[PDB]
Amino acid sequence: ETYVTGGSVAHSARGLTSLFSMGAKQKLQLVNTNGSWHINSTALNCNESINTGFIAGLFYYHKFNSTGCPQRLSSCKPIISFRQGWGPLTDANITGPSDDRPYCWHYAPRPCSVVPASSVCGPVYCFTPSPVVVGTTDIKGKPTYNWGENETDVFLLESLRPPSGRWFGCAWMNSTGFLKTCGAPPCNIYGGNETDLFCPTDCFRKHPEATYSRCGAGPWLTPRCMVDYPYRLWHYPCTVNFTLFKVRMFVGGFEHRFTAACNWTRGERCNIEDRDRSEQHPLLHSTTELAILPCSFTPMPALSTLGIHLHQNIVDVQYLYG
């Protein structure tokens, strides 16, 4: 029986919190719109502060109406559905319309250009893999010079790869509540019935050296897991039932620590093929056990010998002292 050990779940991270008793009044739920399913931007208070939003997100564990989530997720595809990859990595050039639904893990985003704040609700979050909130600055003073009309207080991202730039990718919701994200260009794995995956994340199984550092652009680390943040439910609704884990990145020489959620349920077949590469480093460094991402592994060989040692039934464990 496949299960985890260190998997923390925030589904019932509450008790006797009935002071608000109803979603702190900004109830969130999905609504269809001409065959498209986005969040109900109408009620959906928008001008909250960081503390108010954090309080609002604390109460959001139970009242989320799981009705449109499956048919909305029908657009997303597993990593198997794509085709193989080979050759040296090349940076893709995303241009023109992008019909694909951005909430899928395998969505290739556009470069993170300037964006006015008149068409965004809630904070915008960039991912130097840990998440960071991004502020703004007035548009009248600088020569950006009125992208829209009499607008103000405009966001700007303009970041390269985090080893050189500032963040991998950023995400938010636009004024009508639809998810909007951008990031660094992803990797093309073919230039140098199925569809051609453009690898916005660590596509290890479909390409061997397409690591997150080289290819990752966005909150997705693996096709199964992602980096969590207070507005994760705010942006992506369907990831509510995920389970949390602690992650240590070590990106670009600097040290990064955060938490990650995963689309993991007990009993999933995870024999040998459903393992994805991800780069963790030990948090305690001792006890020879590593709480690594479920259905995954790390390129850190064992103490005495090499060869990744992983358990039959519990997948979050990485073994040392082989």
């Binding site: 085709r83 199984r205 390409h207 093929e273 590469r277 060989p301 010998t305 060869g307 990744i308 992983l310």
Partner: protein, 84 residues
Amino acid sequence: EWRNTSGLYVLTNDCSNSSIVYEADDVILHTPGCVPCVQDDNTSTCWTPVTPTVAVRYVGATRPRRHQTVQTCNCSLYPGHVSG
């Protein structure tokens, strides 16, 4: 470190053709990062590593021979961990 199957890269501890530097009838030398696995006839078995660079069939380490360098091999990626 990885092998090819049904158009899907998969992690393994089997050595590639390029990961082995020298091999003899009873000893293989290889770059660290894999483990040798050999098939002779309807029988593929695993090779015991000591000082991981060099691996031996059975523990009798102390004339090259091309021993089929196959990768239909599962061992050492589930340790079968004995209690520590």
